[PDB]
Amino acid sequence: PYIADCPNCGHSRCDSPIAIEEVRGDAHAGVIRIQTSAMFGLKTDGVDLAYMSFMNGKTQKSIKIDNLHVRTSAPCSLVSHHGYYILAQCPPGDTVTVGFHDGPNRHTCTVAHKVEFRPVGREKYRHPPEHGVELPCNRYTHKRADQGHYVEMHQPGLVADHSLLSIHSAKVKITVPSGAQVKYYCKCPDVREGITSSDHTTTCTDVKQCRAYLIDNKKWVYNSGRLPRGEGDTFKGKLHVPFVPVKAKCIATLAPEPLVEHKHRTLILHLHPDHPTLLTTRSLGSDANPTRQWIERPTTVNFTVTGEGLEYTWGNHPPKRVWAQ
């Protein structure tokens, strides 16, 4: 579970494990795929997707997911998590605002991202309905058994941990997690690399002038922009994405039927939608003479139909056609 710098972490820029990168309000189904720097899913070892492992300290905390909250302008709905990554059904929102509850603390993370949800169709809803026609939307999956893409996930760079740099009663005293690789020296001249167990520091004294580092590359990370490079190498760790964008047919929009009214080679149409509906036509002469107008306000319109025919498209309701001799 990677940890990075959340931008407006409740107060201001903290370093949250759930630091939000790559917000994708690019689908249609009320859904956003998000990456936390935290890797929830199974535990550290082997069990139960519905548990929760973020970083506390240098360490993980692979425990229950109890009170996740993604949210935006309104509280979102989770869809599924896998890896670093969560899918959640959100409404539109100027921002994105994520957070669980460990239990002692709220411990959330928030971010800017322009979000919208147009459904696919000539109706510009704000939200998916219960009914209407199905038609080919873009949307992310529920599932994990997924390989359609993979993002590079090589090592972490080092990280700071000044909990290490204690004092040896006059000298600044570094320690190690588990024998991990601590990269160490101070502004003064003393040990210059640091690949060690718990060292002391002969020369410097102040904690604030030393290299508290953790080369702990036993587990790779996501290659966040808010990661410091592991300077050594491009290690392996090509790793999939679960939530591929797929060609789901969203349960989708439908605009109320029109009121057809006859006139001489002319369609008066008293019209009354639910939401802004893009109407348009095609006078089937080799003179096309089409028309487009989003209609949200109910409006009686007109169409000079010709002899050979016109067609009529009340939103994603199917196209009509008309003989006006």
Partner: antibody, heavy 117, light 110 residues
Framework: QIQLVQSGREVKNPGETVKISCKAS????????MLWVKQAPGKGFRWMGL????????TYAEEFKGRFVFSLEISASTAYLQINNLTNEDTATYFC??????????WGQGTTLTVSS | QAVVTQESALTTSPGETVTLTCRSN?????????ANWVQEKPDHFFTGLIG???NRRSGVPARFSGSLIGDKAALTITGAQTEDEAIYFC?????????FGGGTKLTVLG
């Protein structure tokens, strides 16, 4: 079912190298990596690292990065511990172990080294 | 850079319920520490009992169960048996390495 049978115990004078084998039985080698643990005479149990029997990458505990080298005869379901430039305080017993079920489920018999001139 | 601590020795009688604990020096033990319990019988004989806090290895009697009690991992032997007299070690995961406890010598009447 699962048997990890280890090599027999060696004697080696300071400075030498030793290769301790761990031959695995009962599981598919490849889906379960190997833990190497040192139980030193007095001191108790210590994790020496883990080897990804799939890719082949080893993790060493910091105490063990250096003279210790994990490798595997993949092909024969063997994992091996090699301790080079043997120090006298390396006398102890080394166990191979299978990492599974969010911990370790099976331990080997142990191979005891007595570093001594 | 973490120290797992366990009771030194515990004595019980056949038929009793006994609890061994595993404490971490850094903080409460949690499910992301994947507490493991290992038993050492004489002859350098190791077997794994529980993993990932409460998963019992296969073929380990049911009298053995693991859990988190308070801020520590615990192993309960319900109906201890004479055969359970051995050294029990706990192991805790810390994001990149394993730390083993000192082990608890358990003595069971029989």
């Amino acid at each position: 079912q699962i048997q990890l049978v280890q090599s027999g115990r060696e004697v080696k004078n300071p400075g030498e190298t030793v290769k301790i084998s761990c031959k695995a039985s009962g599981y598919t080698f490849t889906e379960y990596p190997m833990l190497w643990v040192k139980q030193a005479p007095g001191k108790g149990f210590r994790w020496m690292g883990l080897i990804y029997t799939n890719t082949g990458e080893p993790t060493y505990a910091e105490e063990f990065k250096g003279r210790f080298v994990f490798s595997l005869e993949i092909s024969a379901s063997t994992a091996y511990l090699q301790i080079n430039n043997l120090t006298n305080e390396d006398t102890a017993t080394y166990f191979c172990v299978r990492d599974y079920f969010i911990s370790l489920d099976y331990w080997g018999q142990g191979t005891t080294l007595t570093v001594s001139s | 850079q973490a120290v797992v601590t366990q009771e030194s020795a515990l004595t019980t009688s056949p038929g009793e319920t006994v609890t061994l604990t595993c404490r971490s020096n850094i903080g409460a033990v949690t499910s992301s520490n994947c507490a493991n319990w290992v038993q050492e019988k004489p002859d350098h004989f190791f077997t794994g009992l529980i993993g990932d806090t409460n998963n019992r290895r296969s073929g380990v009697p049911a009298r053995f169960s693991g859990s988190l009690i308070g801020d520590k991992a615990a192993l309960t032997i319900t109906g201890a048996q004479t055969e359970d007299e051995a050294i029990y070690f706990c192991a805790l995961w810390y994001n990149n390495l394993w730390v083993f406890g000192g082990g608890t010598k358990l003595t069971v009447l029989g």
